[PDB]
Amino acid sequence: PTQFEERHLKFLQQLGKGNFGSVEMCRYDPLQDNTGEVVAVKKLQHSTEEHLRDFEREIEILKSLQHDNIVKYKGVCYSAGRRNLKLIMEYLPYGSLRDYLQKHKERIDHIKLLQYTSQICKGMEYLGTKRYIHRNLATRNILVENENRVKIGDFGLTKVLPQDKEYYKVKEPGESPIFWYAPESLTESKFSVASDVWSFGVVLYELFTYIEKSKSPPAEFMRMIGNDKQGQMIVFHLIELLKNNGRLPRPDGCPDEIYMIMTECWNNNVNQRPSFRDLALRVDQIRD
Ligand SMILES: O=C(Nc1ccc(-c2ccnc(Nc3ccc(N4CCOCC4)cc3)n2)cc1)[C@H]1CCCN1
């Protein structure tokens, strides 16, 4: 059931749009009926040949993944009479963990936060087994299936390690989520499981802020660097702050033991950052 016909793939709702991609909720009814299944469809926006090649790689990555905490691949639609490509995924009703945390604060306490943490770690452990580097871990990129299950959604930025190295060097990017980046990613464009672990620390910070507006990583880092500055000088200041131990603060209400996990992920010493496997084991112990 891996190939979906464009004639039966009906638009329902916008789910998230960027400069280079869009995801929509759609209904797939091939028995032309109503019983058809609801899916999520990712398509490029402002597509180029190079972006299409990248998208094919992103599709093959998601298809290669089978895990409870990773959005389920369903197939591809070769749309415009088989002259274009769209990616078909399962549909997750509850949106992004960022939006969910903000809307449903009153049924989320600390143990629930840590249940999400743990599930994120486990998806990340699984990604590690395929030598994939996510490069974009953020609560906006984590999806909520139900109150008991979250899933890493979006592999737009994901790279596969060379078979002979432990790091991937990106030259290209331009625009990047700099406030979630490890310092060597900012300085050297080097990406690794260790840099994913750094980003994971920032995700843990996001959770314990419960998405209160002025507590976001960009809001905080810009407070710290000076919310006056503009263009490159922002990145200059961020690198300098990080290299010399400026860090996000402990959120209000966050236990020491949980902030400590964050600060250990935020190690400038790449080789001393914890593994996703020891993070899962730690978090699971704090949860009991
Ligand atoms: O948005 C992105 N990626 C993305 C990846 C996967 C999904 C996805 C895959 C499966 N289910 C859902 N569910 C979902 C349900 C509701 C909502 N919302 C959106 C607005 O408010 C209602 C809840 C968002 C996602 N979303 C959504 C977006 C990336 C690519 C374009 C820009 N940034």
Side-chain angles (χ1 to χ4, degrees), residues 1-31 33-288:
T2 142
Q3 284 177 245
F4 283 73
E5 315 180 51
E6 88 184 293
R7 67 190 309 188
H8 301 318
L9 206 245
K10 307 312 214 282
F11 179 82
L12 257 25
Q13 214 85 253
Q14 185 103 132
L15 294 182
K17 180 188 248 197
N19 306 307
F20 300 114
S22 177
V23 179
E24 292 169 336
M25 194 205 325
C26 299
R27 212 205 271 95
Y28 190 68
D29 213 335
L31 269 316
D33 201 50
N34 218 63
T35 55
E37 146 204 76
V38 173
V39 286
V41 183
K42 178 170 184 175
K43 52 188 199 187
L44 295 181
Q45 290 298 96
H46 312 100
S47 182
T48 60
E49 229 159 280
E50 143 195 292
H51 291 349
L52 213 29
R53 212 67 206 55
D54 282 350
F55 188 38
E56 269 177 282
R57 294 205 34 92
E58 184 187 340
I59 287 148
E60 283 308 306
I61 287 166
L62 186 65
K63 177 171 181 176
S64 69
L65 301 168
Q66 198 174 259
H67 191 281
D68 288 338
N69 307 302
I70 302 299
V71 70
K72 281 181 166 151
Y73 171 79
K74 286 319 177 152
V76 295
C77 176
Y78 301 95
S79 47
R82 170 93 183 64
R83 296 161 307 128
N84 201 22
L85 182 68
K86 298 179 172 187
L87 168 56
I88 320 308
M89 266 175 278
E90 72 175 338
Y91 177 69
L92 269 18
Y94 289 93
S96 79
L97 172 60
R98 188 176 69 181
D99 295 345
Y100 186 85
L101 253 155
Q102 232 166 189
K103 291 188 271 215
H104 294 291
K105 290 152 12 283
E106 297 177 70
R107 67 194 208 240
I108 311 158
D109 43 34
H110 286 357
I111 54 89
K112 179 63 71 169
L113 292 186
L114 294 174
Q115 176 189 193
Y116 302 157
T117 303
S118 180
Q119 293 177 5
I120 297 157
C121 287
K122 287 149 178 199
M124 291 308 165
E125 297 184 58
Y126 179 84
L127 269 202
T129 75
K130 314 278 217 192
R131 294 173 67 70
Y132 296 156
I133 310 308
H134 186 273
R135 303 213 306 125
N136 205 15
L137 232 23
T139 67
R140 75 159 277 119
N141 289 327
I142 301 307
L143 296 285
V144 181
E145 187 185 11
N146 62 47
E147 78 186 345
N148 291 137
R149 184 102 104 219
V150 303
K151 297 197 198 193
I152 307 161
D154 226 286
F155 295 86
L157 292 208
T158 302
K159 291 315 192 184
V160 183
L161 292 170
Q163 226 173 194
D164 46 276
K165 314 200 165 209
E166 285 306 84
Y167 265 62
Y168 188 94
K169 212 140 171 69
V170 191
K171 198 191 80 97
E172 121 268 309
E175 40 272 296
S176 310
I178 68 168
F179 297 116
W180 280 254
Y181 273 15
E184 72 287 352
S185 301
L186 287 164
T187 62
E188 289 169 357
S189 300
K190 296 170 170 180
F191 298 89
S192 64
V193 348
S195 75
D196 281 343
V197 168
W198 170 293
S199 296
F200 165 84
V202 177
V203 172
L204 180 62
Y205 173 86
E206 295 177 84
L207 298 169
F208 280 78
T209 64
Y210 280 92
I211 330 296
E212 299 195 348
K213 176 174 199 300
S214 61
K215 302 311 199 247
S216 66
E220 296 280 5
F221 280 129
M222 296 292 210
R223 184 160 306 122
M224 284 174 228
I225 87 126
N227 65 74
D228 29 285
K229 49 258 279 180
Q230 281 202 303
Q232 291 319 302
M233 193 59 84
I234 291 171
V235 200
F236 300 172
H237 279 263
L238 176 64
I239 292 161
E240 188 61 26
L241 169 159
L242 290 173
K243 174 248 193 297
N244 303 116
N245 199 48
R247 292 295 184 262
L248 296 158
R250 186 176 65 75
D252 274 315
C254 182
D256 166 64
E257 226 196 346
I258 297 159
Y259 186 60
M260 287 185 51
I261 302 188
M262 299 175 206
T263 51
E264 299 182 343
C265 297
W266 305 322
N267 204 140
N268 299 165
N269 196 141
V270 179
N271 302 146
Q272 307 177 169
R273 297 174 196 150
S275 69
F276 283 111
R277 287 165 32 38
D278 58 40
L279 289 164
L281 260 1
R282 283 181 85 189
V283 171
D284 283 355
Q285 279 42 74
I286 298 176
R287 292 172 67 201
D288 15 293

Short mmCIF file of all heavy atoms in Angstrom, two decimals, residues 194-218:
data_model
loop_
_atom_site.label_atom_id
_atom_site.label_comp_id
_atom_site.label_asym_id
_atom_site.label_seq_id
_atom_site.Cartn_x
_atom_site.Cartn_y
_atom_site.Cartn_z
N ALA A 194 26.32 13.53 19.30
CA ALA A 194 26.65 14.50 20.37
C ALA A 194 26.00 15.89 20.22
O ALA A 194 25.53 16.51 21.27
CB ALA A 194 28.21 14.63 20.52
N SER A 195 25.95 16.41 18.98
CA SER A 195 25.21 17.68 18.70
C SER A 195 23.72 17.50 18.78
O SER A 195 23.00 18.39 19.26
CB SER A 195 25.65 18.36 17.36
OG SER A 195 25.13 17.69 16.24
N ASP A 196 23.22 16.33 18.38
CA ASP A 196 21.80 16.02 18.67
C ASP A 196 21.52 15.96 20.15
O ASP A 196 20.42 16.36 20.58
CB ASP A 196 21.31 14.71 18.02
CG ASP A 196 20.96 14.88 16.51
OD1 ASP A 196 20.78 16.01 16.02
OD2 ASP A 196 20.76 13.85 15.89
N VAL A 197 22.45 15.37 20.89
CA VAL A 197 22.30 15.32 22.42
C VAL A 197 22.25 16.78 23.04
O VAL A 197 21.48 17.05 23.98
CB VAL A 197 23.39 14.41 23.11
CG1 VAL A 197 23.41 14.61 24.69
CG2 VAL A 197 23.15 12.90 22.78
N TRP A 198 23.04 17.70 22.48
CA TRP A 198 23.05 19.10 22.92
C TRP A 198 21.63 19.67 22.67
O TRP A 198 20.97 20.24 23.58
CB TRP A 198 24.11 19.90 22.16
CG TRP A 198 23.98 21.40 22.42
CD1 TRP A 198 22.97 22.22 22.05
CD2 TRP A 198 24.86 22.18 23.22
NE1 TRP A 198 23.18 23.52 22.54
CE2 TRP A 198 24.34 23.51 23.26
CE3 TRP A 198 26.08 21.91 23.85
CZ2 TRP A 198 25.01 24.57 23.89
CZ3 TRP A 198 26.74 22.96 24.50
CH2 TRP A 198 26.19 24.27 24.53
N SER A 199 21.14 19.47 21.42
CA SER A 199 19.80 19.95 21.06
C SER A 199 18.71 19.35 21.93
O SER A 199 17.69 20.00 22.20
CB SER A 199 19.48 19.68 19.57
OG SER A 199 20.36 20.43 18.72
N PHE A 200 18.87 18.08 22.25
CA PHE A 200 17.95 17.41 23.14
C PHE A 200 17.89 18.14 24.52
O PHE A 200 16.79 18.28 25.11
CB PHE A 200 18.33 15.95 23.31
CG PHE A 200 17.64 15.29 24.50
CD1 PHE A 200 16.33 14.77 24.38
CD2 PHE A 200 18.26 15.24 25.76
CE1 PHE A 200 15.64 14.22 25.53
CE2 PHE A 200 17.60 14.69 26.88
CZ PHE A 200 16.28 14.19 26.76
N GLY A 201 19.06 18.52 25.06
CA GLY A 201 19.05 19.40 26.25
C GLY A 201 18.14 20.62 26.13
O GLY A 201 17.45 20.96 27.08
N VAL A 202 18.21 21.33 25.00
CA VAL A 202 17.36 22.47 24.75
C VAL A 202 15.82 22.09 24.71
O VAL A 202 14.93 22.80 25.24
CB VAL A 202 17.76 23.22 23.40
CG1 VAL A 202 16.78 24.35 23.16
CG2 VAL A 202 19.28 23.66 23.30
N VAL A 203 15.55 20.92 24.14
CA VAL A 203 14.19 20.38 24.13
C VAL A 203 13.70 20.12 25.55
O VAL A 203 12.55 20.39 25.86
CB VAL A 203 14.08 19.04 23.28
CG1 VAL A 203 12.62 18.39 23.47
CG2 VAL A 203 14.48 19.21 21.81
N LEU A 204 14.58 19.56 26.38
CA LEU A 204 14.25 19.35 27.81
C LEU A 204 13.95 20.69 28.56
O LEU A 204 12.88 20.83 29.22
CB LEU A 204 15.28 18.46 28.50
CG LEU A 204 15.13 18.09 30.03
CD1 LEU A 204 13.88 17.34 30.29
CD2 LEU A 204 16.35 17.18 30.36
N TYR A 205 14.83 21.67 28.36
CA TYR A 205 14.54 23.07 28.73
C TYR A 205 13.14 23.59 28.24
O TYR A 205 12.33 24.12 29.06
CB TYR A 205 15.68 23.98 28.29
CG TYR A 205 15.34 25.43 28.50
CD1 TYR A 205 15.59 26.03 29.76
CD2 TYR A 205 14.69 26.16 27.51
CE1 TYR A 205 15.28 27.39 29.98
CE2 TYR A 205 14.32 27.54 27.74
CZ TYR A 205 14.64 28.12 28.98
OH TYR A 205 14.28 29.41 29.22
N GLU A 206 12.84 23.42 26.95
CA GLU A 206 11.54 23.80 26.41
C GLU A 206 10.42 23.14 27.20
O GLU A 206 9.49 23.84 27.61
CB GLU A 206 11.34 23.50 24.91
CG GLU A 206 12.20 24.25 23.93
CD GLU A 206 11.87 23.72 22.55
OE1 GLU A 206 10.87 24.24 21.98
OE2 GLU A 206 12.50 22.69 22.12
N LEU A 207 10.50 21.84 27.44
CA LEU A 207 9.42 21.19 28.14
C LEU A 207 9.14 21.89 29.50
O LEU A 207 7.99 22.27 29.80
CB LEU A 207 9.64 19.70 28.30
CG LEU A 207 9.75 18.91 26.95
CD1 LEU A 207 10.23 17.50 27.17
CD2 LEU A 207 8.46 18.92 26.23
N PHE A 208 10.21 22.09 30.28
CA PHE A 208 10.07 22.60 31.64
C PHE A 208 9.77 24.09 31.71
O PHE A 208 9.42 24.60 32.78
CB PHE A 208 11.26 22.13 32.48
CG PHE A 208 11.08 20.76 32.95
CD1 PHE A 208 11.32 19.69 32.10
CD2 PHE A 208 10.57 20.49 34.22
CE1 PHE A 208 11.11 18.33 32.52
CE2 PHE A 208 10.34 19.16 34.62
CZ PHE A 208 10.66 18.08 33.78
N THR A 209 9.83 24.78 30.56
CA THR A 209 9.27 26.12 30.48
C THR A 209 7.76 26.11 30.21
O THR A 209 7.14 27.19 30.27
CB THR A 209 9.88 26.97 29.37
OG1 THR A 209 9.58 26.38 28.06
CG2 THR A 209 11.36 27.15 29.61
N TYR A 210 7.20 24.93 29.91
CA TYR A 210 5.79 24.77 29.45
C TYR A 210 5.40 25.74 28.35
O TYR A 210 4.24 26.12 28.28
CB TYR A 210 4.77 24.92 30.61
CG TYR A 210 4.61 23.69 31.48
CD1 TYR A 210 5.38 23.53 32.62
CD2 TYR A 210 3.66 22.72 31.17
CE1 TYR A 210 5.26 22.41 33.42
CE2 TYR A 210 3.52 21.61 31.96
CZ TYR A 210 4.32 21.46 33.08
OH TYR A 210 4.19 20.34 33.88
N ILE A 211 6.37 26.18 27.53
CA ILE A 211 6.17 27.14 26.42
C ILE A 211 5.61 28.55 26.80
O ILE A 211 4.92 29.21 25.99
CB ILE A 211 5.42 26.47 25.14
CG1 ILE A 211 5.74 24.95 25.01
CG2 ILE A 211 5.71 27.23 23.86
CD1 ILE A 211 7.24 24.56 24.71
N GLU A 212 5.92 29.02 28.01
CA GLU A 212 5.61 30.40 28.47
C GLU A 212 6.43 31.38 27.66
O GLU A 212 7.63 31.17 27.46
CB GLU A 212 5.90 30.55 29.97
CG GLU A 212 5.04 29.60 30.79
CD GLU A 212 5.00 29.92 32.26
OE1 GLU A 212 5.82 30.76 32.75
OE2 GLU A 212 4.13 29.32 32.94
N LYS A 213 5.79 32.46 27.18
CA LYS A 213 6.28 33.14 25.94
C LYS A 213 7.75 33.63 25.95
O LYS A 213 8.57 33.41 24.96
CB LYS A 213 5.36 34.31 25.54
CG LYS A 213 5.90 35.10 24.31
CD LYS A 213 4.91 36.17 23.80
CE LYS A 213 5.26 36.58 22.37
NZ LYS A 213 6.64 37.15 22.30
N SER A 214 8.06 34.30 27.06
CA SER A 214 9.31 35.00 27.23
C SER A 214 10.41 34.04 27.70
O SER A 214 11.54 34.46 27.96
CB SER A 214 9.11 36.11 28.28
OG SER A 214 8.72 35.54 29.53
N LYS A 215 10.09 32.76 27.78
CA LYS A 215 11.04 31.75 28.26
C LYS A 215 11.58 30.87 27.12
O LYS A 215 12.24 29.90 27.36
CB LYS A 215 10.39 30.88 29.34
CG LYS A 215 9.87 31.67 30.59
CD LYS A 215 10.94 32.63 31.13
CE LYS A 215 10.69 33.08 32.61
NZ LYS A 215 10.37 34.54 32.73
N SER A 216 11.29 31.21 25.88
CA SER A 216 11.71 30.33 24.79
C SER A 216 13.22 30.46 24.63
O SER A 216 13.80 31.49 25.03
CB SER A 216 11.02 30.69 23.48
OG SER A 216 11.46 31.95 23.12
N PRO A 217 13.86 29.43 24.03
CA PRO A 217 15.30 29.62 23.81
C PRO A 217 15.66 30.89 23.02
O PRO A 217 16.51 31.64 23.52
CB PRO A 217 15.75 28.30 23.16
CG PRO A 217 14.65 27.29 23.53
CD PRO A 217 13.38 28.10 23.59
N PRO A 218 14.97 31.23 21.86
CA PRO A 218 15.35 32.54 21.23
C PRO A 218 15.15 33.79 22.12
O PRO A 218 16.02 34.67 22.18
CB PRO A 218 14.44 32.61 19.98
CG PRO A 218 14.06 31.22 19.70
CD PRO A 218 13.87 30.61 21.08
#
